[PDB]
Amino acid sequence: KLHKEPATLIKAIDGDTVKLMYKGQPMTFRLLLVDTPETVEKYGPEASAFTKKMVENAKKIEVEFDKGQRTDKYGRGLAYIYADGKMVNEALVRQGLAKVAYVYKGNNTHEQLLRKSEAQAKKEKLNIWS
């Protein structure tokens, strides 16, 4: 079973990357299973703003590692980030501000959930899907 761990926001970089204090040390996290537009790509600024707003206004930030590899080649943690219980990864996808990325090294626990939301956002021709 996956476990949520508290973190404290340090700095939101862009749509899919956040800087957090995790276990008494700063660390950069790359949001699992999502590909947001890079800031400046169409919708890049919107995905960045959405992620920033979501994590700054949160009272509680939690990180949840998946069952596969926990860090990428650049040393970024790979996790699902929760802001007051709401998963940022899913929130971005549901809003049409990101696409579900290909599974990476066995980290696929929430792939189905995100695929459903993406289908719906696409069905609503939201943002990236307009």
Instruction: Give the CATH number for residue 58.
Output: 2.40.50.90
Give CA–CA dist 128/98, Å, rounded: 7
Neighbour-count burial of 40, counting CB atoms closer than 10 A to its CB (0-12 exposed, 13-18 middle, 19+ buried) = exposed
Could you tell me which residues are annotated as the binding site for Ca(2+)? 16, 35-36
Q: What residue numbers does the annotated binding site cover? A: 16, 35-36
Residue 30: which domain range? 1-130
Annotated catalytic residues are 30, 38, 76
Distance of CA 43 to the CA centre of its chain: 16
Residues 6+ apart with CB under 8 A from 53: none
Q: How far apart are CA 66 and CA 121, in angstroms?
A: 24
The DSSP code sequence of 76-103 is -EEEEEEETTEEHHHHHHHTTS-EEPPP
Of 84, 62, 88, which Cα lies nearest the Cα of 2? 62
The residues facing 83 across adjacent strands are 61, 86
Give the method used: X-ray
How many domains are contained in the chain? 1
What's the half-sphere exposure (Cβ side, CA atoms, 13 Å) at 119?
6
Task: Say if strands 26-31 and 77-83 run parallel, antiparallel, or are unpaired.
Answer: parallel
Resolution in units of Å: 2.0
